[PDB]
Amino acid sequence: YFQGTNLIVNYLPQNMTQDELRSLFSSIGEVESAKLIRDKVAGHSLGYGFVNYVTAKDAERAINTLNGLRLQSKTIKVSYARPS
């Protein structure tokens, strides 16, 4: 089974801010960094972000707890950020 600290969070609502993203994930455990991706020109969210936990165990708990969470008209996807 895969262990890691780094997550990608997809299908976030357009009005979710980086601070709200950080907060949601901070409820599980200590967050090393949370970054909401936005567009260059218009400042609008691209609807996804990266959340890295201090501990691997907390990233796993974040996936199990928050994957599939329904926010507004979106079902979010939380997974490990892995290459390919």
DSSP per position, the chain: ----SEEEEES--TT--HHHHHHHHHTTS-EEEEEEEE-SSS--EEEEEEEEESSHHHHHHHHHHHTT-EETTEE-EEEE----
Distance CA 24, CA 19 (A): 9
Q: How far is CA 4 from CA 20, 29, 62, 75, 77, in A?
A: 23, 14, 11, 23, 17
Q: How far is the C-alpha of 70 from the C-alpha of 27, rounded, in Å?
A: 16
Q: Domains in the chain, please, with CATH?
A: 1-84 (3.30.70.330)
Q: Are residues 51 and 30 in contact, defined by beta-carbon separation less than 8 angstroms?
A: no
Experimental method: X-ray
Closest of 50, 78, 52 to residue 66, by C-alpha: 78
Q: Which of 4, 9, 80 is nearest to 20 (CA)?
A: 9
> Sign of dihedral through CA atoms 26, 70, 62, 36?
negative
